[PDB]
Amino acid sequence: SGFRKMAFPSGKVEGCMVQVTCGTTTLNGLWLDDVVYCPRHVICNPNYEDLLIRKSNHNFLVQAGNVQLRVIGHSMQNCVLKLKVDTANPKTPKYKFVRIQPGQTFSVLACYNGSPSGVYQCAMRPNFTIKGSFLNGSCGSVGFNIDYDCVSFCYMHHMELPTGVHAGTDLEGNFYGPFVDRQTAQAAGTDTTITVNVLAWLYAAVINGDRWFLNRFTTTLNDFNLVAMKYNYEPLTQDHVDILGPLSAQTGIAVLDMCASLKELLQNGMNGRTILGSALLEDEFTPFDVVRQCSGVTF
Amino acid sequence: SGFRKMAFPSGKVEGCMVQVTCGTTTLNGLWLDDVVYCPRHVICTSEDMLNPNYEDLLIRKSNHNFLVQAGNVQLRVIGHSMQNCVLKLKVDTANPKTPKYKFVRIQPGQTFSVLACYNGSPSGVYQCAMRPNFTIKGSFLNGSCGSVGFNIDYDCVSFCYMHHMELPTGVHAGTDLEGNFYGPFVDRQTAQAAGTDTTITVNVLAWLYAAVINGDRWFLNRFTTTLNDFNLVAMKYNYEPLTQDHVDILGPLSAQTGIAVLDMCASLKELLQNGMNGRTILGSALLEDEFTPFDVVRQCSGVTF
Numbered sequence: 081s082g083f084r085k086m087a088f089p090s091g092k093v094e095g096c097m098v099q100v101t102c103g104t105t106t107l108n109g110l111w112l113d114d115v116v117y118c119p120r121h122v123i124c125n126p127n128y129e130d131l132l133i134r135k136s137n138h139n140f141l142v143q144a145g146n147v148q149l150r151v152i153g154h155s156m157q158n159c160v161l162k163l164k165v166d167t168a169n170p171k172t173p174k175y176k177f178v179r180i181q182p183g184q185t186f187s188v189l190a191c192y193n194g195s196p197s198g199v200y201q202c203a204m205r206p207n208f209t210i211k212g213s214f215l216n217g218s219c220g221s222v223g224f225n226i227d228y229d230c231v232s233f234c235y236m237h238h239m240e241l242p243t244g245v246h247a248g249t250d251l252e253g254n255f256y257g258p259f260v261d262r263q264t265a266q267a268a269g270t271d272t273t274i275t276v277n278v279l280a281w282l283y284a285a286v287i288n289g290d291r292w293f294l295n296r297f298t299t300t301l302n303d304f305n306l307v308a309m310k311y312n313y314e315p316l317t318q319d320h321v322d323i324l325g326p327l328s329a330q331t332g333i334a335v336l337d338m339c340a341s342l343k344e345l346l347q348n349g350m351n352g353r354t355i356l357g358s359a360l361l362e363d364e365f366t367p368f369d370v371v372r373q374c375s376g377v378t379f
Numbered sequence: 380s381g382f383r384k385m386a387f388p389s390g391k392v393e394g395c396m397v398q399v400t401c402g403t404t405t406l407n408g409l410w411l412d413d414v415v416y417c418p419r420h421v422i423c424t425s426e427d428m429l430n431p432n433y434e435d436l437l438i439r440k441s442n443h444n445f446l447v448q449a450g451n452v453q454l455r456v457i458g459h460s461m462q463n464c465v466l467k468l469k470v471d472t473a474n475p476k477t478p479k480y481k482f483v484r485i486q487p488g489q490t491f492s493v494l495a496c497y498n499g500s501p502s503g504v505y506q507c508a509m510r511p512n513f514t515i516k517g518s519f520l521n522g523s524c525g526s527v528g529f530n531i532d533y534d535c536v537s538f539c540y541m542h543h544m545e546l547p548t549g550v551h552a553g554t555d556l557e558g559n560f561y562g563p564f565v566d567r568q569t570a571q572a573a574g575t576d577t578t579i580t581v582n583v584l585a586w587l588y589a590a591v592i593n594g595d596r597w598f599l600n601r602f603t604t605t606l607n608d609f610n611l612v613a614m615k616y617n618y619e620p621l622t623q624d625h626v627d628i629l630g631p632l633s634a635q636t637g638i639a640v641l642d643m644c645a646s647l648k649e650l651l652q653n654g655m656n657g658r659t660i661l662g663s664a665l666l667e668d669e670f671t672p673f674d675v676v677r678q679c680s681g682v683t684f
């Protein structure tokens with residue numbers, strides 16, 4: 081029993097965190113094989129092609145623990161700097177670089193000075209920002225999932241927006257959302273609630289014996305989406321319904337049965353009650369996260 | 380900016396998780412130096428759970444009856460002792476990834492990270508607090524016994540909890556790393572239920588100071604209170620009594636924000652009285668009690684907003 085927000089074990093990622101210093105800037109880097117990946121703003125209206133051509137190999141100080149790493153090459157892929165190091169990382173795990181979609185969750189290993197300080201789980205919001213916990217010097221700290229023996233790296237931290245939300249790139253340097261890596265007037269767009277995740281969390285509540293929100297009623301996909309659009313909820317697609325199939329089967333509550341229960345929670349509220357110890361409807365647990373936490377999947 | 384419930388990096392603990400099997404039962408073990416620590420109920424069947432005689436069951440077991448598996452490698456048991464509710468298996472090889480560690484007994488209110496494992500394989504990490512009733516609201520399915528709770532302060536992993544059982548209400552009970560249970564729980568299948576739980580008041584106040592540090596001041600007021608008058612109101616809402624020790628501990632946060640501890644107690648008294656009225660403090664619609672004053676200082680900047 082019990083339902084918690086659970087990050088993946090950060091162990092295979094901790095062995096990859098190094099500290100990158102270029103002049104006055106000091107951020108974190110990801111050491112995979114003979115390459116260290118970090119935000120391209122470490123060299124810093126910027127002209128990165130012009131700033132980078134002026135930098136020598138020894139102008140980058142990569143420190144892995146107490147050992148000092150020697151930079152022997154440097155290239156740039158989008159908003160990520162790739163520093164060819166003289167030594168390959170002995171603790172390099174099995175990895176993939178993946179681009180996740182808004183709604184999908186991941187673990188973040190928050191680091192400062194190439195030293196990991198904490199791990200937490202979060203979701204890529206529909207507006208492309210992440211509600212993370214970052215202070216100055218956290219740039220370069222990565223987001224990941226572990227599926228089997230493979231660490232799929234999905235996010236690299238770049239910046240904090242005026243409202244306290246965060247923006248970063250995939251491991252190829254492509255930003256998530258309309259953000260650019262420079263100091264300009266940029267703000268987070270209007271956010272929506274990830275509907276497929278709220279439903280998955282309602283299924284986890286029933287799996288844990290919380291059934292107060294259920295009712296005899298059902299609804300249709302269109303009638304539910306009209307109501308959801310009014311409460312700033314992401315539209316629920318036929319793909320979403322199919323994905324909630326294993327949970328619908330395990331609990332015996334049809335996806336459109338659960339949609340009628342959500343419609344009612346959205347209309348009249350919790351009425352002083354809590355679902356899984358929460359007074360808000362949680363949207364940072366994907367249907368796979370729910371299945372994985374209520375099965376016992378190990379790595 | 381941003382305030383999240385944050386577990387410690389589980390890396391130094393992952394390298395210590397092994398799988399312990401005795402007969403038909405299979406749980407997790409903690410491999411430190413040449414010793415594997417695990418719950419003693421590993422030597423029990425389901426029948427033995429009603430009234431077990433652990434000394435009588437243990438005397439019948441030899442080293443080769445324990446199958447410790449670390450990854451793919453099979454570990455050889457060369458000795459076995461018992462300290463309270465934990466079994467200590469002397470293994471033939473010392474763990475090469477043994478981190479710098481301490482065994483600590485935490486007090487109700489204190490927080491820790493849990494590395495949930497199944498078959499000596501870690502599956503997830505999460506942060507939780509030792510509740511005033513001595514249980515933990517964790518996420519544990521069958522096969523997770525022997526999963527541990529820890530804090531990492533500097534290069535040291537202080538092990539504070541080992542998971543043993545789940546109570547009828549879905550809450551969890553375990554021992555310190557010396558096998559001494561937290562609370563009046565016993566490793567027996569008997570009629571035992573979690574006592575009435577209360578809200579950790581010192582932690583709610585710490586979390587209210589973390590909200591002021593992040594520029595959330597809507598809940599503050601022009602009132603103060605005496606420690607006794609606050610506790611009389613707090614008991615009515617099932618809150619833990621605030622002690623003079625608690626006030627002293629909140630000193631740095633009181634100073635950093637410029638809000639006296641009893642000033643914040645007045646805002647908490649009013650918050651309990653009125654509710655949130657549709658507002659949220661640090662993105663939450665409930666008052667959070669699983670962030671200690673030490674966790675707030677560790678996560679939050681020294682520069683108030």
Ligand SMILES: CNC(=O)CN1C[C@@](C)(C(=O)Nc2cncc3ccccc23)c2cc(Cl)ccc2S1(=O)=O
Pocket residue numbers: 081420428519520521522523524542543544545546565566567568569
């Ligand atoms: C649902 N809980 C139970 O039926 C508890 N019983 C089994 C057991 C082994 C126990 O608690 N095992 C579990 C631990 N954590 C999590 C669990 C989740 C699911 C199922 C068992 C879980 C045990 C251990 C001790 Cl120390 C005392 C009594 C008992 S017991 O025989 O009463």
Ligand SMILES: [Cl-]
Pocket residue numbers: 484485486489
């Ligand atoms: Cl303590």
